[PDB]
Design a protein around this ligand. Structure first.
Ligand SMILES: O=C(NCCN(CCNC(=O)c1cccc(=O)n1O)CCNC(=O)c1cccc(=O)n1O)c1cccc(O)c1O
Ligand SMILES: [Fe+3]
Ligand code: NA
Ligand code: NA
Ligand code: NA
Ligand code: NA
Length: 175
């Protein structure tokens, strides 16, 4: 009833050295999206969405994703609590998500003011999902950065049809 490309070993997922949590704050556009549950679709292409990171006093992120769906703005809210090392996080209040037993975030690379690559691994209803997101501070990034994202996604076992580049939009994500 479900087939998934296996999640890579964490050894294949680099960590951004000297992660600066204050500089990673603010709005990021999802210009690239890859994962074992991500599928390319050409009848209904994925629309670009935005994810806003806000550091609280206790140094956990409030993470709000803003999606344009059904002619309305949908808000997906979660909390990233600092993990085993800087640039790694786990999900706050995992009990609120039914079936979710694990959720790991790892910032693979970033220059903070233009681009980032972030790796996610979650175990939900015993199934191990993973995704990589190419974050852009703007809605567009260079071909070099996008090709690097594709290369990295492929290095984690993902084929091309599991790698998408959401189409830029103006609704919801510009506020
Ligand atoms: O199980 C969850 N969601 C399932 C619903 N969708 C599948 C997510 N697909 C992934 O490939 C997947 C794999 C690994 C980690 C991960 O987070 N995600 O999403 C679709 C709806 N998505 C959103 O509503 C959505 C919109 C914007 C950002 C976002 O993360 N999500 O999930 C889930 C639970 C807790 C926290 C999350 O961030 C989740 O995505
Ligand atoms: Fe998610
Ligand atoms: Na299913
Ligand atoms: Na949460
Ligand atoms: Na966890
Ligand atoms: Na391929």
């Amino acid at each position: 009833t479900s087939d998934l490309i296996p999640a890579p070993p964490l050894s294949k997922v680099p960590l951004q050295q000297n992660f600066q949590d204050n500089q990673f704050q603010g709005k990021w556009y999802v210009v690239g999206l890859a994962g074992n549950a991500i599928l390319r679709e050409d009848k209904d292409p994925q629309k670009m969405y935005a994810t806003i990171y806000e550091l609280k006093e206790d140094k956990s992120y409030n993470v709000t994703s803003v999606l344009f769906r059904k002619k309305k703005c949908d808000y997906w809210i979660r909390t990233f609590v600092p993990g085993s090392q800087p640039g790694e996080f786990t999900l706050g209040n995992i009990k609120s998500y039914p079936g979710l037993t694990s959720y790991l975030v790892r910032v693979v690379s970033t220059n903070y003011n233009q681009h980032a690559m972030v790796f996610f691994k979650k175990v939900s209803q015993n199934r191990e999902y993973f995704k990589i997101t190419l974050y852009g501070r703007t809605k567009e990034l260079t071909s070099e950065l996008k090709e690097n994202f594709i290369r990295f996604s492929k290095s984690l076992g993902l084929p091309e049809n599991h790698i998408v580049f959401p189409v830029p939009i103006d609704q919801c994500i510009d506020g």
